[PDB]
Structure formats: C-alpha cells, structure tokens
C-alpha cells in the first residue's frame, strides 16, 4: 500500500537518497488514486531534488566544455561526457512528465491540485528546454508555456495571490519568460504584477500562509531587481 | 589509454558526481600500473565520497529505527539492509581492486593502499554484525599494522599518511573496540611526534598536518571526556 511507501519516502528523504524517494512516490502515482497535498509535496520535493542534481552537473560540464573549446580531442571527450549527462537529465524529466500527463493531471479534481500539477509539468518542460536546442527546444518550450498559461488562467479564477501555490506559479512563470522565452521585459512585468497583487492583501494571510507567502514574495522582489539590474 | 580515463574521472569530479569517477578510476587501475599520487588521490576521493553518502544514510536510518517504539520498524530495517548491502558491495569492490593491483605494488604507495584497505574494512565494521565483525576488524588491524610498520620505518612523522594511519586506527580503537585509552595513547604519540617537526613541515603540509592534528586534538577531547 502507498501508506507504507509514504514512510519509505520520508526515510529516503532524511537519508538524502532522493532517488529511492522518487521511486516510492512514482509507484504511489501509479496507484491511480488522488494524492493528498502531503504526498503531492513529497513527490514535488523528490523529483525536484533528483533533477536539480543533474541540472547542476550539466551546467558544470557545459561550462568546462565551453572554457576549453581550444583543447581538441579532450574537448571532444568532454562533449561525449556532457551528452551522457544530458540523456540522463532528459530521461528523468520525461519520467516525471509522463507520470504527470498519464496519472496526476488526468485525475486532478481540485482546482488547487490542477494548478500544482500543471505548474509542475511546465517546470519540468522548462528544465528540458534549458537542455534542448532548435526545433526540440521550440516544441518543449511551446508545451511548457501552454501548461503554465493553463495553470495561470485556472489559478487566476480559483485562488487569491494570498495562497502560496499561486505565487509559486507566478515566480516560476516569470522565470520561464526571462530564461526560456528571452523576454526580460515581459518577465519583469509578470513578476511585478503578481508581487503588487500580493501586496494588496499581504497582511490578510494566516500564520503559516504569511510565512510561506513572504518566503516566495522575497524571491519575486529579488528576481525583479536581478533582472532589472 | 590511462590518460584519457584519468581525464574523464577528473571531469566527473568537477561535475561533483562521483559514481562515474570511481567506475572510471577502477578501469584505470585494472591496467596494473602504479597509480601516481594524483590519480591515487582521485581514486581515494572517488570511493570515499561514493561510500560516504551511503554511510550518512545508514547512520540516519539506524537512528530512525532506534526512534521506533510493526511494519514501520520492519521497513526501516529493510531499507537499512539495502543501504548496507550497497555499502558492502562498494567496499568489497575497492578491497579486491587494492588486493589484486595496488597492494601487490614504493613504501608511501604501500602505506596508502594498506591504510585504504584498513579504512574500508572499518567502514564495513560500522555496518557489520555477527562473529565476522571480528574477522573484518582483524583484516583491518592487519593492514593498519603493515602500514604502521612501513610508516614508522620509512615515513618522517611529518608525513600526512603516517598521521592519517594513527587517526583512523584510533577511531577504530574507540568506535569499534571501545578502548579510549588505547586510542589516546597512539594519537598523543603521533601528535607529539608531529610537534617535534612542527616547524620542519612543508609549505603545503603545514596546513595538512595542523588540520590532522586539530582533528586529533578534538577526538582526543571526545575520548577523554
């Protein structure tokens, strides 16, 4: 039963062995039943950690490669190693994507859950876009944008910016506009509109929601300055 | 060629993912060549990190099991056993490589590989159970003894290898043998011997030696406490 896998996931988390946590929640996804917000958060953390490690690795190898473009044969070997990383990163992204598309997104009944999973789909497609080039990049970026816009249009109707999942969506959506759509002015406009829409009710949040909201809004504010700089 | 393998390992190290680093250094060593201090250091970094992540996990899981009052405890035990089998497999993978290629082949090299053998047997001892816990430790003390002999005869007390032997052997004495007096004796001996050359250390090894001595002083405080 998935109830047991939940404990297994927490165990894999505390050990900093996210691969097993992901393998556990992956099978929790294949149960077809609707995940509770706790399980949803666990699955988010799991794949976010697993992809992040490869993202960091890829950026490091890529940088080393571009730093040594004059090194001939060893540059060639470094490139082979880099591609050998990229296929892993892509496989992890496609794994989580297919899981979301075939089990979580089809089943999500709650507006909140719909937003969370659509957002996650967008995020993982963005991580693929960061890796891809040409028409591959175009197709991945288009579907990522499609997912974010769908989540944005849903959350705009169903949730105030006083809820952290809406802010999380706005932050990541703005990052996509800036980093992937190459639209920094659009990114800043989106981020600022979300931040000031939040400011309008920032003192109405609950004890936990205000902490969560502030934790996200401070990132919104900092990204705004980082991009305007 | 060994040079390209070494380069790929270096690349994996820079990428900060070590499993592929270890898997490349393994085949570098299967050529039967004497690993120079750079590739030797790379190999140590590789297997040390590959085992260390599992070690942390095992400690954490063992703590959770102890925190249990059931399927909960059964599951924790099973995950612990999975981690231990992984860690055991990697340690065996290293010990056989040393026994088949590195330990069969300078005094410094000899001592480095023997110490490595001891430390890998010690990491097994941290996960071991049953009467074979003694056999694991036995093989560890055997290697550490050969290391201590070669180092006392051919390594100045300024040598970082000679100090690492005593530090780990003492950790073995306190954590595996619960003998703080045995640990503190060897540790203090090494510490004062290094101090007898406190100004004789090399420009880089000053920091190396003092860091080892700082750890020695701290664990000395721990075992005396």
């Amino acid at each position: 039963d998935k109830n047991e896998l939940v404990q297994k996931a927490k165990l894999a988390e505390q050990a900093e062995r996210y691969d097993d946590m992901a393998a556990c929640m992956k099978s929790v996804t294949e149960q077809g039943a609707e995940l509770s917000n706790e399980e949803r958060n666990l699955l988010s953390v799991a794949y976010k950690n697993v992809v992040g490690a490869r993202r960091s690795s890829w950026r490091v190898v890529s940088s080393i490669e571009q730093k040594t473009e004059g090194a001939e044969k060893k540059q060639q070997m470094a490139r082979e190693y880099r591609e050998k990383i990229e296929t892993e990163l892509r496989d992890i992204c496609n794994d989580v994507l297919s899981l979301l598309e075939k089990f979580l997104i089809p089943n999500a009944s709650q507006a909140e859950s719909k937003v969370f999973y659509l957002k996650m789909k967008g995020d993982y497609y963005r991580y693929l876009a960061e890796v891809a080039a040409g028409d591959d990049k175009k197709g991945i970026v288009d579907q990522s944008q499609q997912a974010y816009q769908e989540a944005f249009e849903i959350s705009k109707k169903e949730m105030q910016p006083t809820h952290p999942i809406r802010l999380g969506l706005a932050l990541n959506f703005s990052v996509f506009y800036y980093e992937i759509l190459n639209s920094p002015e659009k990114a800043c406009s989106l981020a600022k509109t979300a931040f000031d829409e939040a400011i309008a009710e920032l003192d109405t949040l609950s004890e936990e929601s205000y902490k969560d909201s502030t934790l996200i809004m401070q990132l919104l504010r900092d990204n705004l300055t980082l991009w305007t700089s | 060629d060994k040079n390209e393998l070494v380069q790929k390992a270096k690349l994996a190290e820079q990428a900060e993912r070590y499993d592929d680093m270890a898997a490349c250094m393994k085949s570098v060593t299967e050529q039967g060549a004497e690993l120079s201090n750079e590739e030797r250091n790379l190999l140590s970094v590789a297997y040390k990190n590959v085992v260390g992540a599992r070690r942390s996990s095992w400690r954490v899981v063992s703590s959770i099991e102890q925190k249990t009052e059931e399927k909960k405890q059964q599951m924790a035990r099973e995950y612990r056993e999975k981690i231990e089998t992984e860690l055991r497999d990697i340690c065996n993978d290293v010990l056989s490589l040393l026994e088949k290629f590195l330990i069969p082949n300078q005094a410094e090299s000899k001592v480095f590989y023997l110490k490595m053998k001891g430390d890998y047997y010690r990491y097994l001892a941290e996960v071991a159970a049953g009467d074979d816990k003694k056999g694991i430790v036995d093989q560890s003390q055997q290697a550490y003894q050969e290391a201590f002999e070669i180092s006392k005869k051919e390594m100045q007390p300024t040598h970082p290898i000679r100090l690492g032997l005593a530090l780990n052997f003492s950790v073995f004495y306190y954590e595996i043998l619960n003998s703080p007096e045995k640990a503190c004796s060897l540790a203090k001996t090494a510490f004062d011997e290094a101090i007898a050359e406190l100004d004789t250390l090399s420009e880089e090894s000053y920091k190396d030696s003092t860091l080892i001595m700082q750890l020695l002083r701290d664990n000395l405080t721990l075992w005396t406490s």
Partner: peptide, 16 residues
C-alpha cells in the same frame, strides 16, 4: 561521533 580523514544565473522558483 568521531572524526576521520580529509580529501586529496537566474533566480529560479524555490521549493517548500
């Protein structure tokens, strides 16, 4: 516990 031996730019959306 004991001690043992030494060795030899965008603002992305943060997690919960």
């Amino acid at each position: 516990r004991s001690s043992s031996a030494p060795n030899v730019r965008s603002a992305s959306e943060p997690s919960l």
